Design an enzyme around this catalytic site. Structure first.
Site, mmCIF file in Angstrom:
data_model
loop_
_atom_site.group_PDB
_atom_site.id
_atom_site.type_symbol
_atom_site.label_atom_id
_atom_site.label_comp_id
_atom_site.label_asym_id
_atom_site.label_seq_id
_atom_site.Cartn_x
_atom_site.Cartn_y
_atom_site.Cartn_z
ATOM 1 N N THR A 266 38.818 45.962 38.598
ATOM 2 C CA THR A 266 39.359 44.595 38.311
ATOM 3 C C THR A 266 40.793 44.432 38.816
ATOM 4 O O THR A 266 41.006 43.818 39.897
ATOM 5 C CB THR A 266 39.220 44.242 36.817
ATOM 6 O OG1 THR A 266 40.027 45.103 35.995
ATOM 7 C CG2 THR A 266 37.771 44.300 36.384
ATOM 8 N N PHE A 391 39.818 34.309 34.300
ATOM 9 C CA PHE A 391 39.522 35.196 33.136
ATOM 10 C C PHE A 391 38.380 34.638 32.281
ATOM 11 O O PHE A 391 38.214 35.064 31.136
ATOM 12 C CB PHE A 391 40.807 35.433 32.343
ATOM 13 C CG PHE A 391 41.821 36.224 33.125
ATOM 14 C CD1 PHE A 391 41.642 37.575 33.377
ATOM 15 C CD2 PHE A 391 42.946 35.603 33.650
ATOM 16 C CE1 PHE A 391 42.568 38.293 34.118
ATOM 17 C CE2 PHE A 391 43.867 36.323 34.397
ATOM 18 C CZ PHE A 391 43.675 37.665 34.639
ATOM 19 N N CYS A 398 38.079 36.996 29.136
ATOM 20 C CA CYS A 398 38.524 38.382 29.353
ATOM 21 C C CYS A 398 39.411 38.881 28.216
ATOM 22 O O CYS A 398 40.485 38.316 28.000
ATOM 23 C CB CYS A 398 39.278 38.474 30.669
ATOM 24 S SG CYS A 398 39.671 40.187 31.082
#
Ligand code: HEM
Ligand SMILES: O=C(O)[C@H](Cc1ccccc1)NC(=O)[C@@H]1CCCN1C(=O)OCc1ccccc1
Ligand SMILES: N[C@H]1CCCc2ccccc21
EC number: 1.14.14.1
Length: 453
Positions: A266, A391, A398
């Site tokens: 990521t 996100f 996230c």
């Protein structure tokens, strides 16, 4: 309104369009041709790909739509189990783990992880300081060494020591090969052919390596009694305020596997794309390097100095605008509903949000959507709701967002303080796709400014 649909292959409908190493980039081209919504059919399945802020703002209504596990997430669930990323919202272990772990991931918690992040960031700077003249840097390779080591040390006080070796950790060999197999199976039109029997054996062996090694880290920590300020301690000690229950050891294993995958795939992509855009936009590099010199006045950056790197933060958001490293997420309709006054959906109907297309919506961003301009993010309040979603969305957004941005801001700040960068090969962007995006074969030369650590 009759929904557009891309070209079909008889009984296979649209499935062979995803027979490519670059499925997200293929879907982005289809979006460019068909517009804000298209239907995508496979044998026994239908989804709708959304590209406009107008429709995505509706999809992001949590009263109407919930997180779906895409086929890819269902294949990753075979090793990530009911960890936070591969769990349904309605599974008891999703809300339990969310409630227990949220305080471990807050902006305030970053004060506690900062020292460990600096330890790893200093190892990266010292590696680059020690390169000889005309050697070069493999950028995604070194960013992955950094982000894996960071989650190892903040996650469970474990040193992967990635900067000491060219061959991966045994856990990582099995993890990379498991992820590749999961993604390979998406295009597979005939999974039961005994030509894939070997792939099947290798997958079960990889799942067993990951389970055995993480189960040992948990048993070892329970055996030691050690109360290190890390996620494993938070998970052994934490009670859900709702149920009053802790996580069981099986679920803790799945959360550690989940966080190790996130730590590999990521932030390392974000950092690689950010450096790509800076070497391609030298005026933007000058502004970010000036901020790093003015702000990072100590040999070791402080938490407060990282919060002061406003322009470095804008660079990271503009990289996430153009190449959101986790590029798509899946939703289902909770009940029958009508999308954008035009598209009737039945309970259970699937949507896919194409984040790179959302981030190129000209009605939101203006006509220059392909230009790299961090100044778009000068004022957070000027970005409309649901226009910028790197996100994800709502309660299933996230959990690592603050962690990812704190690590990336610290590391990119120290890189711009310590070195000048050269795009010595005039690198042509080549985006490799796993679950996430990375610029494959991106290389640079660094010249030390000779500022001591
Ligand atoms: C550039 C860095 C990152 C990006 C762009 C990113 C992006 C995302 C996105 C888009 C989702 C939503 C997925 C979905 O709806 O299916 C997500 C979920 C998640 N991310 Fe990240 N992520 C990043 C870094 C991290 C890090 C560092 C961690 C942990 C260390 C992490 C852990 C997670 C977890 C656990 C979830 C599931 C949350 C839940 O549903 O409760 N991510 N991320
Ligand atoms: O996995 C899927 O269901 C779809 C592709 C598909 C396959 C078969 C029939 C119809 C559609 N996946 C996607 O559209 C995207 C592109 C490739 C992988 N992917 C995806 O969502 O991956 C999982 C993921 C990655 C990152 C963040 C959240 C979820
Ligand atoms: N950060 C998310 C989105 C990108 C892929 C991924 C993989 C594992 C755990 C979490 C995540």
């Amino acid at each position: 309104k009759e929904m557009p649909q891309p070209k079909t292959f008889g009984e296979l409908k649209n499935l062979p369009l995803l027979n490519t190493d670059k499925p997200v980039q293929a879907l982005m081209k289809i979006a460019d041709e068909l517009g804000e919504i298209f239907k995508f059919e496979a044998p026994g399945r239908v989804t709708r790909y959304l590209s406009s802020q107008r429709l995505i703002k509706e999809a992001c209504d949590e009263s109407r739509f919930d997180k779906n596990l895409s086929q890819a997430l269902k294949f990753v669930r075979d090793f990530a189990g009911d960890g936070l990323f591969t769990s349904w919202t309605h599974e008891k272990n999703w809300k339990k783990a969310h409630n227990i772990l949220l305080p471990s991931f807050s902006q305030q918690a970053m004060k506690g992880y900062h020292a460990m992040m600096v330890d790893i960031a200093v190892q990266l700077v010292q590696k680059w300081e020690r390169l000889n003249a005309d050697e070069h840097i493999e950028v995604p390779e070194d960013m992955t060494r950094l982000t894996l080591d960071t989650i190892g040390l903040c996650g469970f006080n474990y040193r992967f020591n990635s900067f000491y070796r060219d061959q991966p950790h045994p856990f990582i060999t099995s993890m990379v090969r498991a992820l590749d197999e999961a993604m390979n199976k998406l295009q597979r039109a005939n999974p039961d052919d005994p030509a894939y029997d070997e792939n099947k054996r290798q997958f079960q062996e990889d799942i067993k390596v990951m389970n055995d090694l993480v189960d040992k880290i948990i048993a070892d920590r329970k055996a030691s009694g050690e109360q290190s300020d890390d996620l494993l301690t938070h998970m052994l000690n934490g009670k859900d305020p709702e149920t009053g229950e802790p996580l069981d050891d099986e679920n803790i294993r799945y959360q550690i596997i989940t966080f190790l995958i996130a730590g590999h795939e990521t932030t390392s992509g974000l950092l690689s794309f950010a450096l790509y855009f800076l070497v391609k936009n030298p005026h933007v590099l000058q502004k970010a390097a000036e901020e790093a010199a003015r702000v990072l006045v100590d040999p070791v950056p402080s938490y407060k100095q990282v919060k002061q790197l406003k322009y470095v933060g804008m660079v990271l958001n503009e990289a996430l605008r153009l190449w959101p490293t986790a590029p798509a997420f899946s939703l289902y309709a909770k009940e029958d509903t009508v999308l954008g006054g035009e598209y009737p959906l039945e309970k259970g109907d699937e949507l896919m949000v194409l984040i790179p297309q959302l981030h190129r919506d000209k009605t939101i961003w203006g006509d220059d959507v392909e230009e790299f301009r961090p100044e778009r993010f000068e004022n957070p309040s000027a970005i409309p709701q649901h226009a910028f979603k790197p996100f994800g969305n709502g309660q299933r957004a996230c959990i690592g967002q603050q962690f990812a941005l704190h690590e990336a801001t610290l590391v990119l700040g120290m890189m711009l303080k310590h070195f000048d960068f050269e795009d010595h090969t005039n690198y042509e962007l080549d985006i490799k796709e796993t679950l996430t995006l990375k610029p494959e074969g991106f290389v640079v030369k660094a010249k030390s400014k000779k500022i001591p650590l």
